[PDB]
């Protein structure tokens, strides 16, 4: 028995691309994994539900050939409508030609093969070891919300619960 992915590295991030081509094979199971804290298996003689504590992330590649700005959201996306409320948040990446940024972009593409090291003027990259240790230093911290911020999380969320609704259709 080898569980892959959602089993293999658990209490850690799953990183996906071609997420619409996962078919329905992955789709219903991960559709459970947004309820998290389980993966059920009734296949063969084994009825267990084994922990997928896995974190989820995907790169969503919309249907061919690019997302169309006039088109309503979810039109580009071929995923189920029930599965996109299951993620917390999503960033849509549009590539729009700008005669400004595509300059520094093409200069960024031509910074290869001229050089090896890309960045300058200026940043100093932060390496994974030392960083990962603060990132693992933090998960131990375990914050506890003050009630003031809690109530604030309620109030602006009411108008958040209003403007997405009062936009209706």
């Amino acid at each position: 028995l080898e569980g892959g992915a959602l089993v293999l590295a658990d209490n850690g991030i799953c990183c996906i691309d071609e997420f619409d081509k996962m078919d329905e094979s992955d789709r219903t199971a991960i559709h459970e994994v947004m309820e998290q804290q389980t993966i059920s298996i009734s296949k063969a003689g084994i009825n267990t539900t084994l922990n997928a504590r896995t974190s989820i992330l995907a790169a969503a590649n919309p249907l061919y050939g690019r997302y169309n700005p006039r088109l309503s959201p979810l039109d580009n996306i071929n995923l189920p409508a029930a599965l996109l409320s299951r993620f917390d948040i999503l960033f849509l990446m549009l590539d729009i030609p700008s005669r400004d940024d595509d300059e520094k972009l093409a200069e960024h593409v031509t910074y290869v093969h001229m050089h090896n090291k890309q960045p300058d003027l200026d940043f100093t990259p932060v390496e994974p070891s030392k960083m990962r240790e603060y990132i693992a230093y933090a998960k131990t911290k375990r914050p506890v919300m003050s009630e003031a911020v809690n109530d604030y999380v309620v109030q602006a969320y009411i108008r958040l619960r209003q403007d997405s609704k009062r936009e209706m259709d």
């Binding site: 009734s42 003689g45 084994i46 009825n47």
Partner: protein, 169 residues
């Protein structure tokens, strides 16, 4: 022209396949469950006439062992076989038999299970009376079958027989 066949019924209690244990060997037991794959009926040797045995001993009886070969054992006198049996088929009285593998019934089996089931052999005129899908009261006769121990001058498993069967269930 007489070979008599015993059948015992209305047994004390129905036992499960999960209830099947080595103590039951050489003992009557009632079990019931669903048919799988009735196989075509082919004769039981019972006794045979095989001889000579160098060159005609015409010895006809017994050889009822489960192999079923062979006659030619301790003949004639004086034929001194060894040798060929030699198989004499015509004097041998035959009976039955067909192998029908019973499957353990679903209503009792504890999902998830995948019920583990073995063969019911139909020796006796009670042969063939069964029909696929039905559960039926059987007679136990646990015993064993040849293909862990070896007889030093092997491998064995459960062989369920019934001298009596009824279609109830």
């Amino acid at each position: 022209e007489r070979v008599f066949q015993i059948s015992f019924f209305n047994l004390p209690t129905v036992h499960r396949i999960r209830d099947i244990r080595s103590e039951k060997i050489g003992s009557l037991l009632s079990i019931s469950g669903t048919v799988t794959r009735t196989s075509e009926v082919r004769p039981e040797l019972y006794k045979a006439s095989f001889t000579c045995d160098m060159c005609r001993a015409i010895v006809d009886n017994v050889e009822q062992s489960f192999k079923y070969t062979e006659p030619t054992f301790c003949p004639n006198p004086s034929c001194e076989n060894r040798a060929f049996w030699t198989l004499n088929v015509t004097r041998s009285r035959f009976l039955d038999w067909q192998k029908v593998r019973i499957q353990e019934n679903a209503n009792e089996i504890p999902t998830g299970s995948m019920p583990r089931t073995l063969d019911v052999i139909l020796r006796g005129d009670s042969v063939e009376r069964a029909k696929p899908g039905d559960r039926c009261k059987f007679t136990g006769v646990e015993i064993v079958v040849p293909d862990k121990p070896s007889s030093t001058l092997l491998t064995y498993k459960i062989s369920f027989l019934a001298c009596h069967v009824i279609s109830i269930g």
